[PDB]
Amino acid sequence: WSLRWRMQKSTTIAAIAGCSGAATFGGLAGGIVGCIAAGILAILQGFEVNWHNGGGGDRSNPV
């Protein structure tokens, strides 16, 4: 399984709130990057029901 991605819009805006449980997997040092990874992970897990049974939607996660 893999995620093929491209940045549609890239910025240098670092104004992102901190979070609880910043990810430490895949060599992440927690922090803001870990907050983003934990957010992506939750969204991917949520979408499993939609590839299993079809459908779309908008899913969110605190970052």
């Binding site: 709130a17 957010g39 969204i43 991917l44």
Partner: protein, 77 residues
């Protein structure tokens, strides 16, 4: 900071009854966060794949607005 939420706007490409292991989901997640977003606000277009099969399309949005950006999913098949 200003951004407090990340959003995923998705649509199904193909039905796939399989499920990626935690190890795979973590690798997907870390790659995008570290090499795509790079700790900054932005928009990513993506496709979840199961081997060579294109399964799901997701537009990932990280912006100042905490509100649902809506719009359409975008992909990277």
């Amino acid at each position: 900071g200003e951004a407090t939420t990340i959003w995923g706007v998705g649509a199904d490409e193909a039905i796939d009854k399989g499920t990626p292991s935690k190890n795979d989901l973590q690798n997907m997640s870390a790659d995008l966060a570290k090499n795509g977003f790079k700790g900054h606000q932005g928009v990513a277009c993506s496709t979840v794949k199961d081997g060579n099969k294109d399964v799901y399309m997701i537009k990932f949005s990280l912006a100042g607005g905490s509100n649902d950006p809506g719009g359409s999913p975008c992909s990277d098949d």
